[PDB]
Ligand binder design. Structure first.
Ligand code: HEM
Ligand code: HEM
Ligand code: HEM
Ligand code: HEM
Lengths: 146, 112, 140, 140, 145, 107
């Protein structure tokens, strides 16, 4: 995945406004509510039976912070996503057995959360740059499958 | 000058339909002409492209998957003249007759 | 497929769109052409630049088709039957593209409905757009 | 959407299976576990070795549910309603896995029906397996 | 990656493949089973029925080009990305084919092999071929990213 | 004016502008619809994807039109390309001391 200088600038300007303690939890929580089969992987998290149980779950909030931190890591190394995510790819592919289609779904839920938070600021060109980012992160996480 | 591609019409509530004016036609010339329509006039009255709204009793036209729909607001008893303009194409003149609520296809013409 | 709660959510959220339907459809198409450029190959006869009348008109066609599907949520395969014949037989749209436009429609709704896009409403709108896509890919 | 020709093809091909339904269901499951190992995580307490009685047993239940779906091809959502509930609510099977089993069922049919697996019959069986998958993932 | 036993099973089956027919059969089945793929082959003429597709000379000749590229992949299993780099750029930049269709063609090829070989196309032989076709699909999608 | 140059390969020549994936839809359709290729009167066979080195054969692929040099002779050589629904294209090339040079293309 390669971003133009104008795309890289737009991505970094929006990301500086992201609340790192909430956005990851919101994206993970929405993934668990919108695609309920993903709950199969987070059974140790306890109650995920309703959208309130999911969105208020402390383990969902804390895990979503780890996930958002890995997305931030990717944003700082856009030209070497495969290397940056090598250990995480080994974890998700060899140990957890997450189908790589779910990486694409999480990336798209994150894009919906950014659109929801930023509204009109999340313009079609800003979204196009974020789509390259989330596809690159998903492809780097799926690398140990191939 | 006679147009052998437009030969008939169907009647709808407050509208007429030309199913052969097909934006998805297997004939690439019919498809391009329908796609590029810039002006539709009926008896001198300029019609508005309603995009996807109903043309029932309007001075409006819509080109969709069933053909070119024209509202019958400007239609009068006797001979009616429809002129269709399309970018990079010669104007298409359609003649229809109205009598006792019925609209009949008379002819379609175009230069070249 | 779509539960009574999903139908309530879709009707209430799509009712907030109202007169902005064409505007939101045009915005979703622009999001799709910029994020997923291969989708532009389906509109070779279009001026695809920002604010083009052709993209504005097509966006209104798409949003009005969706408004009609919301009114016929109890019998969507029948209401969308002719439209699904067109997309499969004439346009030959690859089924993957329906997921791309559905995602861009959801992003547009999330950007314009900050006070209503809750996790349950998001899930209902996702189910609705997937149901429309299922009907639109059923005639292969 | 399943045309009269598709229904004829599915009934003729599935009718050639006959008494080998359990055997072919077990073979399709074995093809799936070997080709797509992540699918094994859905059966943690099964003996998944070659020729295991648990795999044979499960293969016959899968094959019989498909035989029932062929008999109720005109009203499949109703016939597979309880099975849709189990896979989505209790087992939480990821919808991508239905494409994997459908592919392994098609591969088994191709391997056992040399004369019957023509391109048209292949397309009819693909449409049938996609319709079963759609029904089985409808209760999310 | 393929184990030595998997690599051996793949090569033994591939040597029995009729290079003049199998590609046409796989392309023809892709066009019949997933009809939206016909959008890319309008220049091939008549594809209106399964018989017109399977009997079309352009479908047969194109299948030979495709099977030749799969054979090239089989000879360079450790460098599929490099082997398919120019084909990957072509399919993206010139043909605009969504990479999901590469997975579909690989699966149709697996069905053609099962159909021709029957009982010989065992579950372990198929598992090795699934690694190959996923590796070819991933190499062809590489220049899209 | 669309065919203006050629390249030399092992027992074959290549016309890059005779591109079946051209951005010019007329060049793309002409190459796709090729029905006959002759070199000095000798009919060439479409080899589909096989090598054209030292053959009376042609292949149209992503790098252009590859023609074998089996029927090539010293001096003026005439290549005629026929395409369904198009006027024949005549390419004139010269061969001297093992080198093949582009002279002209007409239609
Ligand atoms: C593409 C986006 C993703 C990113 C960046 C990501 C990142 C992470 C990180 C940073 C961890 C912690 C690793 C550690 O403990 O060292 C993790 C764990 C995990 N991930 Fe993901 N992940 C992604 C997608 C997914 C998806 C889609 C699923 C499942 C549907 C998933 C399921 C898990 C599970 C089950 C764990 C372990 C949680 C635990 O036991 O606490 N991941 N991921
Ligand atoms: C939510 C899904 C969709 C809806 C509701 C929708 C709706 C529509 C409508 C209402 C029309 C006009 C039909 C007519 O003329 O009667 C149309 C046309 C068309 N659609 Fe779709 N569509 C959808 C998805 C797609 C996708 C995914 C693509 C491709 C990326 C696509 C490509 C086209 C094209 C090429 C046309 C013809 C445009 C023209 O010639 O003016 N559609 N669509
Ligand atoms: C063609 C599609 C499928 C059909 C017709 C089918 C059919 C069935 C049937 C009839 C049962 C047994 C019902 C019962 O006795 O309670 C069952 C159970 C089950 N299915 Fe499926 N199934 C399909 C796809 C899948 C897929 C794709 C997976 C996952 C990879 C899966 C995983 C399971 C599991 C884990 C069980 C429970 C096994 C047990 O512990 O007894 N199924 N299925
Ligand atoms: C993963 C498997 C695939 C392989 C190995 C493959 C291989 C090839 C090869 C060798 C060529 C000829 C390139 C040249 O002229 O030099 C080609 C062309 C082409 N491919 Fe593929 N391809 C694959 C999948 C697909 C798919 C899935 C589609 C579409 C749905 C597709 C559509 C085309 C088209 C339209 C052409 C050009 C045909 C022409 O103009 O004659 N390919 N491919």
């Amino acid at each position: 995945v390669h971003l133009t200088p104008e795309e890289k600038s737009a991505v970094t300007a929006l990301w500086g406004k992201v609340n790192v303690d909430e956005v990851g939890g919101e994206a993970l929580g929405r993934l668990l509510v919108v695609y309920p089969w993903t709950q199969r992987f987070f059974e140790s998290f306890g109650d995920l039976s309703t959208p309130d149980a999911v969105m208020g779950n402390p383990k969902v909030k804390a895990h979503g912070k780890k996930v958002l931190g890995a997305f931030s890591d990717g944003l700082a190394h856009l030209d070497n996503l495969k290397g940056t995510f090598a250990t995480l790819s080994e974890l998700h592919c060899d140990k957890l057995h997450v189908d790589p289609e779910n990486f694409r779904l999480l990336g798209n839920v994150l894009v919906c959360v950014l659109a929801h938070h930023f509204g009109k600021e999340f313009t079609p060109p800003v979204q196009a740059a974020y789509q390259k980012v989330v596809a690159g992160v998903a492809n780097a996480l799926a690398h140990k499958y191939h | 000058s006679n147009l052998s591609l437009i030969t008939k019409l169907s009647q709808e509530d407050g509208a007429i339909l030309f199913p052969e004016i097909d934006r998805y036609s297997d004939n690439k010339q019919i498809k391009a002409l329908t796609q590029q329509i810039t002006k539709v006039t009926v008896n001198g009255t300029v019609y508005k492209d309603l995009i996807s709204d109903s043309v029932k009793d309007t001075n409006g036209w819509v080109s969709n998957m069933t053909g070119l729909h024209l509202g019958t607001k400007a239609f009068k008893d006797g001979e009616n003249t429809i002129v269709i303009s399309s970018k990079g194409f010669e104007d298409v003149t359609i003649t229809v007759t109205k009598k006792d609520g019925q609209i009949h296809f008379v002819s379609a013409k175009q230069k070249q | 497929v779509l539960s009574p709660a999903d139908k309530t959510n879709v009707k209430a959220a799509w009712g907030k769109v109202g007169a902005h339907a064409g505007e939101y459809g045009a915005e979703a198409l622009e999001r799709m052409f910029l994020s997923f450029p291969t989708t532009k190959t389906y509109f070779p006869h279009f001026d695809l630049s920002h604010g083009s009348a052709q993209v504005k008109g097509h966006g209104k066609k798409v949003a009005d088709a969706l408004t009609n599907a919301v009114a016929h949520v109890d019998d969507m395969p029948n209401a969308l039957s002719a439209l699904s014949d067109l997309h499969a037989h004439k346009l030959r749209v690859d089924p993957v593209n329906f997921k791309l436009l559905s995602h861009c429609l959801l992003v547009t709704l999330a950007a314009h409905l900050p006070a209503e896009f809750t996790p349950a409403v998001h899930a209902s709108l996702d189910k609705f757009l997937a149901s429309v896509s299922t009907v639109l890919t059923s005639k292969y």
